């Protein structure tokens, strides 16, 4: 049974959790609490990891880091990355465009100047969301009729960005509607209501935005 | 004949250029000069691009953005991404670990506080480089005997990081040796000596680090 190691936060790994749950995949978690950085520094080089980091995925022999390699791998095992170069690259484009939002948040969230940097990010964010709103015009999910992993990436980014600004989706009905549709997927619905859902923090606990024990 | 659009800078796209040259691939470039931001704002939505950005790749019907989707696509056309989920994920791990360095630089390079932020990045950088030095112990390239696209990604990151600190490879002989080996690849050697090589800037021209018309 594979292992997903990460902090007990949403952060980089939350979209991978959602995808594991959507595929009804078994996995145990190594969850590093806020006060358990020492427990991590003590396992870091003892896991057989060639690029030691968090998150890590361990599928006995397959010993993986980098959250994007991990999410893509799980999708790969279920044959969900694309059937030719073209489709594979559209998925990788969806992927990276979502990351522009999610990393956009992460890159300012630990800054002393978070509050002012917030203004410049929320100015840009409508252009970014519009690309996704247009893609979902006549298209149920990001890649058509079936879920792919960038759907869960997008879901995660909308969730996070709605804490930063509760009104940032009011111009984007198809995006509001996408977020609900992911929530209605029976597997996802059971997970978000379960003991395993980590509601908070969005970021590391020490962050100006999305940190702390509670919202 | 496909088109690679980008600023006339190294930036996000330089590793893709290197890979196109290694594969002896034909491509014309759209190169946005420093003073040509208006020329770009005027083509941005007229290219058939669903997530308009720079870089973009256009392979007639295939209309792509996001530099990581683009680099991976070109490699895909040459069957270089991996033959099973396992190998595909190792490549994606190599990829992302290199990006930790390259984005690590980009994320501070435009900051007012660049010079102090530089200190904290160069403190971390030896741990990051050590993972690559260890991987290249008994292994010619990052993935064994053959070049894969993360090799050119690593090359780009070493080049950039050596401007930040000319001595940052003095503890890492196998990495110094990797950088030279890429330079000795006949295709790469011809490109770096050619009119097409864009030596500078490393970043956008407005950057504190790696900017300006000249080094
Ligand atoms: N690009 C990497 C980023 C790795 C990273 O910045 N990891 C953070 C977690 S948010 C960490 O605290 N890692 C522990 C460590 O560096 O030892 C990824 O996608 O996994
Ligand atoms: N994650 C994206 C980043 C896109 C990006 O930040 N592009 C910069 C170039 S360094 C830009 O000036 N794009 C022009 C625009 O946003 O209209 C990628 O890898 O292509």
Swiss-Prot record, chains A, B:
Chain ranges passing through the membrane: none
Reactions catalysed: RX + glutathione = an S-substituted glutathione + a halide anion + H(+)
Record CDD domains: GST_C_Mu, GST_N_Mu
Broad enzyme group: transferase
One Pfam family linked to the record: GST_C_3
EC number: 2.5.1.18
Protein's GO biological process: glutathione metabolic process
GO molecular function, one term: glutathione transferase activity
Keywords assigned: Transferase
UniProt: glutathione binding residues: 6-7, 40-44, 53-54, 66-67
InterPro entries: Glutathione-S-Trfase_C-like, Glutathione-S-Trfase_C_sf, Glutathione_S-Trfase, Glutathione_S-Trfase_N, GST_C, GST_superfamily, Thioredoxin-like_sf
Positions of substrate binding: 110
GST N-terminal domain boundaries: 1-82
Domain GST C-terminal: 84-202
Superkingdom as given in the UniProt entry: Eukaryota
Role this protein plays: Conjugation of reduced glutathione to a wide number of exogenous and endogenous hydrophobic electrophiles. GST isoenzymes appear to play a central role in the parasite detoxification system. Other functions are also suspected including a role in increasing the solubility of haematin in the parasite gut.
Further comment found in the protein's record: There are at least two isoenzymes of GST in S.japonicum.
Subunit structure: Homodimer.
Family the entry assigns: Belongs to the GST superfamily. Mu family.
Protein name stated in the entry: Glutathione S-transferase class-mu 26 kDa isozyme
């Amino acid at each position: 049974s594979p292992i997903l190691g990460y902090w007990k936060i949403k952060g980089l790994v939350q979209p991978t959790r959602l995808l594991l749950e959507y595929l009804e995949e078994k996995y145990e978690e190594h969850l590093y609490e806020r006060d358990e950085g020492d427990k991590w520094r003590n396992k870091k080089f003892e896991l057989g990891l060639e690029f030691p980091n968090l998150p890590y995925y361990i599928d006995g022999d397959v010993k993986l880091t980098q959250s994007m390699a991990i999410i893509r791998y799980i999708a790969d095992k279920h044959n969900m990355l694309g059937g030719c170069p073209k489709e594979r690259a559209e998925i990788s484009m969806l992927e990276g465009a979502v990351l522009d939002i999610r990393y956009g948040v992460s890159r300012i969230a630990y800054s002393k100047d978070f509050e002012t940097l917030k203004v410049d990010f929320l100015s840009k964010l409508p252009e970014m969301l519009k690309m996704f709103e247009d893609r979902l015009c006549h298209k149920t999910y990001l890649n058509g009729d079936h879920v792919t992993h960038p759907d869960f990436m997008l879901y995660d980014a909308l969730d996070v960005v709605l804490y930063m600004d509760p009104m940032c989706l009011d111009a984007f009905p198809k995006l509001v509607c996408f977020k609900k549709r992911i929530e209605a997927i029976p597997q996802i619905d059971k997970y978000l209501k379960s003991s395993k859902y980590i509601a908070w923090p969005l970021q590391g606990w020490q962050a100006t935005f999305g940190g702390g024990d509670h919202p």
